[PDB]
């Protein structure tokens, strides 16, 4: 039987089959509800719109994210996301197809418990697995050793692996990713005059961030360049036809990833997080983590981030070590591609959490069987 | 059992059955009462005249409109209008047929209370319902989304509806329509030596407004053209035999719709009211609404109004928007046609306000049941 990989990220659900190269169904994880009064009777008036339909009719909908910082808050909304991504996107029956899910490290355990219980009682499977995203990213990079910075839409985590042995005391989680960048861009877009308050306008500011934003190599020189001349300014067309023009806010929005104190967080940026995750490891393997800095996630999809990361780690590391940022062009879907490796591996077939094991051991086998 | 549709506008009652294309009875809502000393005994003398008979003998009658700006003041006159349009015009029993009535938005509630009370106690029905006219106009246009500018004889209102979901905070109401234009034409027809002060003469000035008037594409150029040459001047024959000739007053009378400051009103024109009702909506849906300007009512029956409205909205909107105005040739009765859409729907059978629910909850259930 062919398997399913369903990366339930905070922003974008990426679901599809096993053995494929690209994910079949990429759609954002929002649940929309109508907030006005319907006057036309009938017309297929649904009480809820899930996914890209909620992207389409978004001017009359309140959009709720079921996932915040890797932790599923609303569980009926997550059931609606899973029902949509099984029955509408893929059009599959989960009773005859295995499923691998991805999970951030340092997650609360009851999230995994309710994920296992919904996947075994509501959408009950022959088998399923819950894995760590950084192991799948290092699978898709094609190497055995390396440190992975995975930054989705809620969770930025650094996990180092040497020779297939992960070090659990060096795992570093930071709750700063693209949704906080979207909220900070909504905060700083009001400086120029453009106001975005609703949940519908969050998608517009997210589209502005996806199309126009980039990581600056030097923040002070780019701020002096944007203050001096209007060469870095770019224009964008809104859905109502109005045209906006933004300047330094193209690079101030991803600069929260290297300076969290803009949004009031005490913790350091991603480069010192990666450097402290390197320095928490044992002393022999650090050189083998210095040359294999694998990036993944959509938030590392800016076209300035690899050279900035190389500059900051080269500033932090000793000078006699080679810093090599592994940045593949397909790093956005890469965790899914790692699942398409790991579902296809012949040695993984004994590592399924079967239904008989769940019915024997309760919902307690998921802690001792997984990581 | 077929339903009944009875649009009780400020100027013309349009009544008929459901399922029919044309309105069966279109007649003005006037009540005539005699104002002179009757000297011949007998001869079929009536104390009241309603409708076309009151139009026939209008030289010796005082005509009263029971509805002014959507608010019915004289209620015995309105009972005579309803008794005439049930027993004489339509000749049907109101005890065996449901009756839908229409209503302007932001109408006073006691009008709906007394309408429900007279429909349930004087002309007691199986059921009744109070609906919005712009929903029926958008039904008659055959679409789901769109902004509706309805303009009858008293009320001109803009209602935007997106995907069957109306926006109640964006509904705009203006008390300026064809009766005020008839009074303004009565004011400006005294410039050329023609005096019209009685209520009988208001029908003649309304016939002059219906027949000869048109909307100028540019007001200043057409005024300079009419001041320069006598090419736009037209002649009309009065029923006694006199001939009048008018020039610029063909396009000064419907210019008050686009410019209310002629008749001393602080409100802006209908194009800026339509633009503000678009701009009060959410930012995602405006590209539909600019493509779906829907006009209805007889006051939009001038043969110059759509090009002027397109020029004004095209000047107001940004240049990347397709300004489309849907003005069907049957837009004078289309609201009634929309009632014949809604009363013949199979899903509207559950939304009637019955006799038993009225006797349970008093005459106050029509607020919670309707819009």
């Amino acid at each position: 039987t062919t398997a399913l990989v369903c990366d339930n990220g905070s922003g974008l659900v990426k679901a599809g089959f096993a053995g494929d190269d690209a994910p079949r169904a990429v759609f954002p994880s929002i649940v929309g509800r109508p907030r006005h009064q319907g006057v036309m009777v009938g017309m297929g008036q649904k009480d809820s719109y899930v996914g890209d339909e909620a992207q389409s009719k978004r001017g009359i909908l309140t959009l709720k994210y079921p996932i915040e910082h890797g932790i599923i808050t609303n569980w009926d909304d997550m059931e609606k996301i899973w029902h949509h991504t099984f029955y509408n996107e893929l059009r599959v029956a989960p009773e005859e197809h295995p499923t691998l899910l991805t999970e951030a490290p340092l997650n609360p355990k009851a999230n995994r418990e309710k994920m296992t219980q919904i996947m075994f009682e509501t959408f009950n499977v022959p088998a399923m697995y819950v894995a760590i995203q950084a192991v799948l990213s290092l699978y898709a990079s094609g190497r055995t050793t390396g440190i992975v910075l995975d930054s989705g839409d809620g969770v930025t985590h650094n996990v180092p692996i040497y020779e297939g042995y992960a070090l659990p005391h060096a795992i570093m989680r930071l709750d700063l990713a693209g949704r906080d960048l979207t909220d900070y861009l909504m905060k700083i877009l009001t400086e120029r005059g453009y106001s975005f308050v609703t949940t519908a306008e969050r998608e517009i500011v997210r589209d502005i961030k996806e199309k126009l934003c980039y990581v600056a190599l030097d923040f002070e020189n780019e701020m002096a360049t944007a203050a001096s001349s209007s060469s870095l300014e770019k224009s964008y067309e809104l859905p109502d036809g109005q045209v906006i023009t933004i300047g330094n806010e193209r690079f101030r929005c991803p600069e929260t990833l290297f300076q969290p104190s803009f949004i009031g967080m005490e913790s350091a940026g991603i480069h010192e997080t990666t450097y402290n995750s390197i320095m928490k490891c044992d002393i022999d393997i650090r050189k083998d983590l210095y040359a294999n800095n694998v990036m993944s996630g959509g938030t590392t999809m800016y076209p300035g981030i690899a050279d900035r990361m190389q500059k900051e780690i080269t500033a932090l590391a000793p000078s006699t070590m080679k810093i090599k940022i592994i940045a593949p062009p397909e790093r956005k879907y890469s965790v899914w591609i790692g699942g398409s490796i790991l579902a296809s591996l012949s040695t993984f077939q004994q590592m399924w959490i079967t239904k008989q094991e769940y019915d024997e051991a309760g919902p307690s086998i998921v802690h001792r069987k997984c990581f | 059992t077929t339903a009944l549709v009875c649009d009780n506008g400020s100027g013309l009652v349009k009544a008929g059955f459901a399922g029919d294309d044309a309105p069966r009875a279109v007649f003005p809502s006037i009540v005539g009462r005699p104002r002179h000393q009757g000297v011949m005994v007998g001869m079929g003398q009536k104390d009241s005249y309603v409708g076309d008979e009151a139009q026939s003998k209008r030289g010796i009658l005082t005509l009263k409109y029971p509805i002014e700006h959507g608010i019915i003041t004289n209620w015995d006159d309105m009972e005579k209008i309803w008794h005439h349009t049930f027993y004489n015009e339509l000749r049907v029993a109101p005890e065996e047929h449901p009756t839908l009535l229409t209503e302007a938005p932001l109408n006073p509630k006691a009008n709906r209370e007394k309408m429900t009370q007279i429909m349930f106690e004087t002309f007691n029905v199986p059921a009744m319902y109070v609906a919005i006219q712009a929903v029926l106009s958008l039904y008659a246009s055959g679409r789901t989304t769109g902004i509706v500018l309805d303009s009858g004889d008293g009320v001109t209102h803009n209602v935007p509806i997106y995907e069957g979901y109306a926006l109640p905070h964006a509904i705009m109401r203006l008390d300026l329509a064809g009766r005020d234009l008839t009074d303004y034409l009565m004011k400006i027809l005294t410039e050329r030596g023609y005096s019209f002060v009685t209520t009988a003469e208001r029908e003649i000035v309304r016939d002059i407004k219906e027949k000869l008037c048109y909307v100028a594409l540019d007001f200043e150029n057409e005024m300079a053209t009419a001041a320069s040459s006598s090419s736009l001047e037209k002649s009309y024959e009065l029923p006694d035999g006199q001939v009048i000739t008018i020039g610029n007053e063909r396009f000064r009378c419907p210019e008050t719709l686009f410019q209310p400051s002629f008749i001393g009103m602080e409100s802006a024109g209908i194009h800026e009211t339509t633009y503000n009702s678009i701009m009060k909506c959410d930012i995602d849906i405006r590209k539909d609404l600019y493509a779906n300007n829907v006009m209805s009512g007889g006051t939009t029956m001038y043969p110059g109004i759509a090009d002027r409205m397109q020029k004004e909205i095209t000047a107001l909107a940004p240049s990347t928007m397709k300004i489309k105005i849907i003005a069907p040739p049957e837009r004078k009765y289309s609201v009634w046609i929309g009632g014949s859409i809604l009363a013949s729907l199979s899903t509207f059978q559950q939304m009637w306000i019955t006799k038993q629910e009225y006797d349970e909850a008093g005459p106050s259930i029509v607020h919670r049941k309707c819009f």
């Binding site: 009938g42 017309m43 297929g44 | 729907l345 199979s346 899903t347």
Partner: peptide, 19 residues
């Protein structure tokens, strides 16, 4: 006790929118 032993033993949418 017998019930305790038995219990605890160890399309329309498209037709609507068209019309």
């Amino acid at each position: 006790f017998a019930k305790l032993t038995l219990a605890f033993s160890a399309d329309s949418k498209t037709a609507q929118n068209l019309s």
